[PDB]
Design a protein around this ligand. Structure first.
Ligand SMILES: NCCCCC(=O)N[C@H]1Cc2ccccc2[C@H]1Cc1ccc2c(c1C(=O)O)OCO2
Ligand SMILES: NCCCCC(=O)N[C@H]1Cc2ccccc2[C@H]1Cc1ccc2c(c1C(=O)O)OCO2
Lengths: 148, 148
């Protein structure tokens, strides 16, 4: 569980926001892309796995699960690719809630940024720093504990 | 010192690789950009600060130090912007060594990627996972200790 992430794709302003959530902490990384292709997803996962110890990824849909490019990236980065089928429905809803929460934050900052990508990164910042401990704190504590 | 990062800009294939190094661990994040502008640097810092607790940034040159856009991003993200003047001279060399080491790794993977950006993210991955403990391990341990 320190190494488990979930992909999530949501839409805003005719664009796609691709999100990776560290399941145990709620910590996220996100990017804006024109559309969700295997290529974009593969590149995003490579970035993520270089930055955090990504062991398992629950893919967001069957197209990405099937994608040979995504499979190649997962092989390259040592990621076990899994389906994102919510066998525990606290996952349809927990994801929905995150997308709504992120879009809320994006709207709160949207006027401060010319470009959506900037607003999205502002939202990532606010989300990961928000004391509820913060998600940023939780992920670091979880991984440090695992390491030792 | 858990919050201190250093910017570093290096060149390859007519492109620019912008690197942020967490000084205490050697952990890096990096991106390829067409050229090093205040706008690109500001966006890069926003991304970084959303993902790790960036307190202080030693900027890579005076243009970025001066940039009103970089200053705005640093204000937004709660980053103290500092000059990157190596008052402890082992620093120009430690950066030079990192750039040479990253370019070496990039050359070792370059053939596996159509695009330089992919090779750069492969290099980030290899760099942060390399046992020497790894840089990824060191940054997490340093921050977890600080938090607690
Ligand atoms: N509408 C207000 C105009 C902003 C003037 C100004 O300096 N803003 C800061 C605020 C702020 C706050 C955090 C980070 C960057 C920025 C800058 C914006 C910016 C910079 C770089 C970018 C951007 C944009 C963007 O504006 O999206 O896009 C991709 O690279
Ligand atoms: N056999 C038919 C095609 C094989 C190609 C193939 O799947 N390579 C993997 C290897 C590999 C290893 C790690 C991550 C991605 C990739 C993929 C490459 C790739 C994917 C997405 C991208 C890229 C590139 C790129 O090539 O730079 O650029 C920006 O977004």
């Amino acid at each position: 569980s320190p190494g488990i992430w979930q992909l999530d794709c949501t839409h805003l302003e005719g664009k796609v926001i691709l999100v990776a959530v560290h399941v145990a902490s709620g910590y996220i990384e996100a990017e804006v892309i024109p559309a969700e292709t295997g290529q974009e997803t593969a590149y995003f996962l490579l970035k993520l796995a270089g930055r955090w110890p990504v062991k398992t990824v629950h893919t967001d849909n069957g197209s990405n699960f099937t994608s040979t490019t995504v499979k190649a990236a997962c092989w390259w980065a040592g990621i076990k690719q899994e389906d994102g089928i919510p066998y525990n429905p606290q996952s349809q809803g927990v994801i929905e809630s995150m997308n709504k929460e992120l879009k809320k934050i994006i709207g709160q900052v949207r006027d401060q940024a010319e470009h959506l990508k900037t607003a999205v990164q502002m939202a990532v910042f606010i989300h990961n720093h928000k004391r509820k401990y913060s998600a940023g704190e939780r992920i670091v504590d979880i991984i440090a504990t695992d390491i030792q």
